[PDB]
Design a protein around this ligand. Sequence first.
Ligand SMILES: Nc1ncnc2c1ncn2[C@@H]1O[C@H](COP(=O)(O)OP(=O)(O)O)[C@@H](O)[C@H]1O
Ligand SMILES: Nc1ncnc2c1ncn2[C@@H]1O[C@H](COP(=O)(O)OP(=O)(O)O)[C@@H](O)[C@H]1O
Ligand SMILES: [Mg+2]
Ligand SMILES: [Mg+2]
Lengths: 206, 419, 419
Amino acid sequence: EEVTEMQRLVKGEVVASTFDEPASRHVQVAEMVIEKAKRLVEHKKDVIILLDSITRLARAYNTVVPASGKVLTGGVDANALHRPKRFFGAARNVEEGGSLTIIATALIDTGSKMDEVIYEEFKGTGNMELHLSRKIAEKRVFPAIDYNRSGTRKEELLTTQEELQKMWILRKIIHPMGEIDAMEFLINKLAMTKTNDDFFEMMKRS
Amino acid sequence: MNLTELKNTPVSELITLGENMGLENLARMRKQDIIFAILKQHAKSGEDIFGDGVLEILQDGFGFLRSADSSYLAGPDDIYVSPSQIRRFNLRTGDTISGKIRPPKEGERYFALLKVNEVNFDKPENARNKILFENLTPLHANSRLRMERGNDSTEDLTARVLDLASPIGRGQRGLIVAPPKAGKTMLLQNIAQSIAYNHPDCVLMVLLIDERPEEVTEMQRLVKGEVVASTFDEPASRHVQVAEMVIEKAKRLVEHKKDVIILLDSITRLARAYNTVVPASGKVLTGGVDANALHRPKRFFGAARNVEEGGSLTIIATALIDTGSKMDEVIYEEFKGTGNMELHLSRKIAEKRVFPAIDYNRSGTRKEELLTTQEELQKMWILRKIIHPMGEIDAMEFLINKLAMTKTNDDFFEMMKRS
Amino acid sequence: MNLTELKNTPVSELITLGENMGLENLARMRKQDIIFAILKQHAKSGEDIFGDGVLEILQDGFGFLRSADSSYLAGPDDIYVSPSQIRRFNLRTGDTISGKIRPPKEGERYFALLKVNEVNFDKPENARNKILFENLTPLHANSRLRMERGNDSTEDLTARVLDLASPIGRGQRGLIVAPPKAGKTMLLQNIAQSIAYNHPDCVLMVLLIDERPEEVTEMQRLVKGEVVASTFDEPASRHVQVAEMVIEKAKRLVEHKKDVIILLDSITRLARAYNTVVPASGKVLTGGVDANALHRPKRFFGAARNVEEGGSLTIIATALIDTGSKMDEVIYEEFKGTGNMELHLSRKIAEKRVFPAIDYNRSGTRKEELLTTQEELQKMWILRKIIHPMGEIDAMEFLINKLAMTKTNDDFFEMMKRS
Ligand SMILES: Nc1ncnc2c1ncn2[C@@H]1O[C@H](COP(=O)(O)OP(=O)(O)O)[C@@H](O)[C@H]1O
Ligand SMILES: Nc1ncnc2c1ncn2[C@@H]1O[C@H](COP(=O)(O)OP(=O)(O)O)[C@@H](O)[C@H]1O
Ligand SMILES: [Mg+2]
Ligand SMILES: [Mg+2]
């Protein structure tokens, strides 16, 4: 039922594998998406991939790969996680033309250990990050995004000179505040403003 | 239907109104909860509900519409205002907001303001163009306030003595030095009666800090005006919250070309709460009072100004001395030269059962030429010349008998001219 | 058959009653367990059992019917009430509930209330329409309480001196400043005797904190009223539990147009338990007392009000000074200006074997015009004029001899008129 809702809502190409399907099916479809994206990138086209989830993807990859005779912590082999690294690392910006954008989701605090071992190796492998907090969601405040923990690298190229400075000013105010108090502080400010530009000029008053 | 008239109704009538409406078990609960319950039930009928009060802004950004009837105490019946409405209409702490209030939806415990049609007893558009109080240029007092009452002709001579000892004008920043058990409470009550009688147009506000509950009730019955007070059992933060509420409300009224008179009691009590609330800066001065702790009372006391453009703010405060607390002596010392008018009371005079126990020699005022007239000023100087050689105690009974057999101060003045 | 009469019976008779009933080994066990055992055996006969007490509500939601005989101590004989009965009849902590109690079934260790037929000595339906104490408007004291006893004519002049030094009325919020070993305990006992004699209608309640067990027993035998106390060996939480029980019970009685007089001993001891029970807020003030720690005693002490509609609550407390403990000095300072009547005792006077050791000059009262009459008030002023030049010690023996040779205070008053 989650796959059907995604197809109706997303205006694009949606492919998914259900839980009842074997782990080999998950591997087969995962390689199909990335290989299709790479061919489109070669034709000077931009492809954006929404991945969900790396932990689930690494779960199928670990089972499919045969055992090498050595078992590491959490029952995950070193070569087992090699395949997700290839899939995740393919997100590149081609100088000649086109780009491949990959956005993935990581599961933490799920009560398992595999889902942690997997998260730890996939920490420093991301250009941008986005950490969610369960406690914020418990307060019925959305989106439950940890502003202090979230960040990006080389944001100078993306934003403009004027826009970049405004973001730095906002981060300075948010940092002393806690991860939970920052959201409701930001939500009310954005609620009464039309666009982000109106919010930015309001902070300049203070 | 209207919030302001519902709170003024007696509690006994409040229960009866809710019983016929359909509510139950309203007798054994606080009056504030009853008002919220009645409005909640009446909101189901779909009829519009009118509400008003004094608006304050919290640190988060949203505000509440406090009611002066409950001494600006937080309650379930307080009206909540979204920060968006603040941008539409420039509002700050102290101003009065009146308008329709919508029923609170699920998830919120406070009423929300729907449409505002009256700001500071004026059109909201006109209130947006008012100039801020801090930009106004203060001046010396020039409007004489006749504290003497002729029609009453009561046996108390406090009103007659007060005019002779130290005339009080509009925009004065005077303070009263009153030892304990020296008739300080009745001194303020007599002044309030004259203000409500001689100058009904002037707005009179009475603020009391750390006063007994029975003392607050008597003040409300006697003073014909707006009286707000905080009891001793309430926390020190409550005293700070109400103190800023009164001055902020007064400043907004002054901007509308209105005259506000504030009776403060007491600066020592007010400074006591301010010192505790402010966090320690790591340095403790003499008496346990920080330098920044007394900064807040200075702002409150110094706001008494006479606006050149129009209106004035008169603040009359009381100072406690010889209460056997260094904490209170240090506070008094910094508040000595900060007054345009001074009024020092003597315990020894009160011990002789002579009232009012006012030290005529110690009492005085600055720039009395503007308040009194040319003829009246000279008569006061002649009286002071006779009083000065006499002691602080012998001067009162000398003055009391002279005023006792005279009808008005004019009759007393012409009698002294004989000698 | 009736719970209240069974506890008042002597322990020796209690054992004999249970032996003939059929129970055994009741001699070597606590009296509270014996009452539960006797009721349990009597419940098997099927006869109805009547019970009564003071109702309190726990934080979970259910409550128990504590008994004032055991100083509101938790025991197996306490009556349990379901939260459902609370919705049917609006009950809060303090009120008295009387009715039939059913035998406890298997799985429960407490009796359950079956049907309530008496609430606050009134019909339960009528008690539901009572107005809450907090909505009542307090006023100043106006009902004079004659503390002097004429029929007794005892050699002690404490009652005669107390009226002259500081008259006590209904709804007063006075406090007593008593140094250690200054006859503080006997001072309260003498007041209790006059109240139980001159005003039998008024309800007298005595609360003692951190008192010795032998001191509690003497107080019960001497005071003709309801006496509840907590011993020092009991935990500080027990002191807090009993303190709130007394004031909540008094408030409910005041709502029924009744007058309640509370003798508190002591505020310093009461504040000692309150400070320990409240959790630390992370900030410690001078003397190890938090600002919020003393908030609870302020609520308890400030509840003394004179209801305009009817009834009054009089609270008389004792303050300990010069005890060698700083913490205790800080408590006294915040409780200086909170009282209508003050009564300061002097250790030096007690060292001279002169009683009562009362500082006449330091003692006083506010709004004494309402309590005394026009003729009586003037006589007191004349006496104070003579006493004031004299020292705090010489004034007592001067007053003692004059009162010793006079029958009543009226005879003493006319004697001073000769001079
Ligand atoms: N103008 C006055 N005329 C007569 N008596 C007065 C006057 N002012 C005060 N008193 C006396 O003072 C007493 C109350 O003093 P109080 O107001 O408690 O002093 P303080 O405010 O300094 O504590 C009353 O008993 C009253 O008789
Ligand atoms: N009214 C009085 N008349 C005579 N003696 C008194 C009186 N009040 C107290 N005392 C003396 O005080 C002593 C007890 O003092 P106590 O009550 O322990 O003081 P405190 O309560 O301050 O500790 C007794 O020995 C008694 O002789
Ligand atoms: Mg006073
Ligand atoms: Mg004692």
